[PDB]
DNA sequence: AACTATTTATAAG
DNA sequence: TCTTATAAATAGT
């Protein structure tokens, strides 16, 4: 956008609340497209600072969660650190 | 990118596999940033066309899924259709 | 495994 | 492998 930003908690309770809403949609949109382009099933679960729930699922969310729990092989399992680290590599 | 593309299953088994890998990271990156910018907890579950698993979580993924299962209020619960619709509105 | 032709999202071959 | 001014993602070569 107009300015570049440093990933860090927006201290401003409002721009935070606004950015959340905006990006959340972007996130879901992407998820949507990825889901579709590549014939994959996606589930996305979000909890805002106030522990309120927002969820997207390409299909049948609980169906996906169920598959998940039953999975028994190793697999890509990233976390925030994994991500920051992968980033710094570039 | 160089060309605009229509959201639909990449029929080319290869460009599909490639695009999947690329965008998946983009997805996680975003999720990462959202998680951080806005102090929210995020869990992302992906299954490729071949039923293999990929997951990101801002923190303790199972902790998040657990919260989810226990939630009992109505909440934003989007799905692909909800998304396409919302798009066409623009 | 790069590259790269205001940064589509988002902050004020 | 809500409006632009700008950053950040990415299709394709």
Curated annotation (Swiss-Prot), chains A, B:
The name this protein goes by in its record: Myocyte-specific enhancer factor 2A
Part of the intact protein present: 2 to 91 of 507
The tissues in which it is expressed are: Isoform MEF2 and isoform MEFA are expressed only in skeletal and cardiac muscle and in the brain. Isoform RSRFC4 and isoform RSRFC9 are expressed in all tissues examined.
Fill in the subunit field for this protein. Binds DNA as a homo- or heterodimer. Dimerizes with MEF2D. Interacts with HDAC7. Interacts with PIAS1; the interaction enhances sumoylation. Interacts with HDAC4, HDAC9 and SLC2A4RG. Interacts (via the N-terminal) with MAPK7; the interaction results in the phosphorylation and transcriptional activity of MEF2A.
Q: Which residues carry this modification: Phosphoserine?
A: 58
According to its UniProt record, which protein family does this protein belong to?
Belongs to the MEF2 family.
Q: Where does it localize?
A: Nucleus
Recorded disease is:
Coronary artery disease, autosomal dominant, 1: A common heart disease characterized by reduced or absent blood flow in one or more of the arteries that encircle and supply the heart. Its most important complication is acute myocardial infarction.
What organism does the record attribute this protein to?
Homo sapiens (Human)
Q: How is it modified after translation?
A: Phosphorylated on these sites by MAPK14/p38alpha and MAPK11/p38beta, but not by MAPK13/p38delta nor by MAPK12/p38gamma. Has no effect on nuclear location nor on DNA binding. Sumoylated with SUMO1 and, to a lesser extent with SUMO2 and SUMO3. PIASx facilitates sumoylation in postsynaptic dendrites in the cerebellar cortex and promotes their morphogenesis.
Source gene?
MEF2A
User: Which positions fall inside the MADS-box domain?
Assistant: 2-56
Q: Which residues bind DNA?
A: 57-85
Q: What does this protein do?
A: Transcriptional activator which binds specifically to the MEF2 element, 5'-YTA[AT](4)TAR-3', found in numerous muscle-specific genes. Also involved in the activation of numerous growth factor- and stress-induced genes. Mediates cellular functions not only in skeletal and cardiac muscle development, but also in neuronal differentiation and survival. Plays diverse roles in the control of cell growth, survival and apoptosis via p38 MAPK signaling in muscle-specific and/or growth factor-related transcription.
Lineage, uppermost ranks: Eukaryota, Metazoa, Chordata, Craniata, Vertebrata
């Amino acid at each position: 956008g107009r300015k570049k930003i440093q990933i860090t908690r927006i201290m401003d309770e409002r721009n935070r609340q606004v950015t959340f809403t905006k990006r959340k949609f972007g996130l879901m949109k992407k998820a949507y497209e990825l889901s579709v382009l590549c014939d994959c099933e996606i589930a996305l679960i979000i909890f805002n600072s106030s522990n309120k729930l927002f969820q997207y699922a390409s299909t049948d969310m609980d169906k996906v969660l169920l598959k998940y729990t039953e999975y028994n092989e190793p697999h890509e399992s990233r976390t925030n650190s994994d991500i920051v680290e992968a980033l710094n590599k570039k």
